[PDB]
């Protein structure tokens, strides 16, 4: 990402505590994944806290 070019760049940002960092994981089943936000894995993507 530092040394390259991409045709588009979509950034989703929100205020999120690091104590709930496991609820944003890939296969998580918490309240965040079921009702708040589901990450899309169809393009190369990163998740940064």
């Amino acid at each position: 990402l530092a040394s390259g070019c991409y045709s588009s760049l979509t950034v989703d940002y929100f205020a999120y505590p690091t104590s709930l960092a496991s609820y944003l994981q890939q296969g998580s089943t918490g309240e965040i994944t079921q009702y708040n936000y589901k990450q899309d894995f169809s393009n190369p993507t990163c998740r940064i806290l």
Binding site: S19, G27, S28, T29
Partner: protein
């Protein structure tokens, strides 16, 4: 019956208690609401499955 897991004092790592459940229906939402998950790592399955 998740009462032995949620009633007494928890044991230590060498003296771990084991519960095996067959033929029953459990409320996963209540158990996930009781605890705050710090980290998890799964093998050949994901918690949403």
């Amino acid at each position: 019956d998740f009462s032995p897991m949620l009633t007494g004092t928890p044991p230590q790592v060498y003296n771990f208690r084991r519960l095996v459940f067959t033929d029953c229906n459990y409320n996963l939402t209540k158990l996930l609401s009781l605890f705050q998950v710090s980290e998890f790592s799964c093998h050949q399955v994901c918690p949403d499955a």
